[PDB]
Write a protein that binds this DNA or RNA. Structure first.
Length: 196
DNA sequence: CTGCTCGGCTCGAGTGTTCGATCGCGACTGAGGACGAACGCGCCCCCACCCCCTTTTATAGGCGCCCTT
């Protein structure tokens, strides 16, 4: 039940959809409206919700009441957030039945052991000068882009590329991500990035 | 009354989204033109049977050509 592509949602029972579509608050297309009415009318034996940590959000939580289900199972890997809305999950879905032990899984080999590291990059003198001088929040784009760390990520990626290690670079700022990706001629994914 | 503080508001940018536009193809059809296939008519070829060929003696009339007058 996805806007990008659909497979006759009313035709079959087992369905996979998204919080955004089910809890969509604005005008609904005709076909999506028919599908939504069918979903509301029918009763679901199981309601699986992945990444439950986002459920207590307004629109996402509205889906719980929008759809009817006997048991709504919740699955996730990071059940933590700052706002004290995680406690709301206990009643929104139910009590937390289990939490896997990451260290025990690492010992058992079910999960690859990770050598977690934090590379400290000294900020370049000029960049620090403007960063400290300006009280605005251009610092997000500034300290994210400094010669010491730009050289660092490039060098780290080169070292792992010659080591045949698969790299997944991450960056919150789409602007910085695009700049780094164009400078390193790499395939950045972000924002609109067509599904195809 | 003043000072400090708490978790209620708001923020732009980053995402997840979506309904609406533009651009695009494809698909289809009309008339006209063009080409191919099929059938009709005529032709040559092939296959049969039948006639005619010579040689003989008699005949009489007709016909033709050559020779003589």
């Amino acid at each position: 039940f996805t806007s990008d592509a659909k497979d006759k949602p009313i035709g079959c029972s087992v369905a996979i959809s998204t919080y955004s579509m089910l809890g969509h608050t604005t005008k609904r297309s005709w076909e999506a409206e028919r599908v939504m009415e069918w979903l509301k009318t029918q009763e679901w034996g199981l309601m699986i919700l992945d990444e439950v940590h986002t459920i207590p959000a307004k629109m996402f939580r509205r889906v719980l009441t929008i759809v009817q289900a006997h048991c709504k199972l919740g699955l996730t890997a990071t059940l933590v957030r700052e706002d004290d809305k995680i406690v709301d999950l206990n009643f929104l879905i139910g009590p937390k039945l289990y939490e896997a032990n990451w260290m025990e899984l690492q010992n058992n080999g079910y999960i690859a052991k990770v050598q977690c590291a934090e590379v400290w990059c000294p900020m370049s003198p000029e960049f620090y000068r403007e960063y400290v001088a300006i009280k605005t929040k251009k610092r997000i784009l500034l300290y994210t882009m400094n010669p010491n760390k730009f050289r660092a990520c490039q060098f780290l990626i080169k070292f792992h590329e010659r080591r045949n290690d698969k790299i997944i670079v991450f960056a919150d700022n789409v602007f910085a991500l695009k700049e780094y990706a164009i400078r390193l001629n790499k395939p950045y994914i972000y924002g609109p990035t067509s599904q195809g």
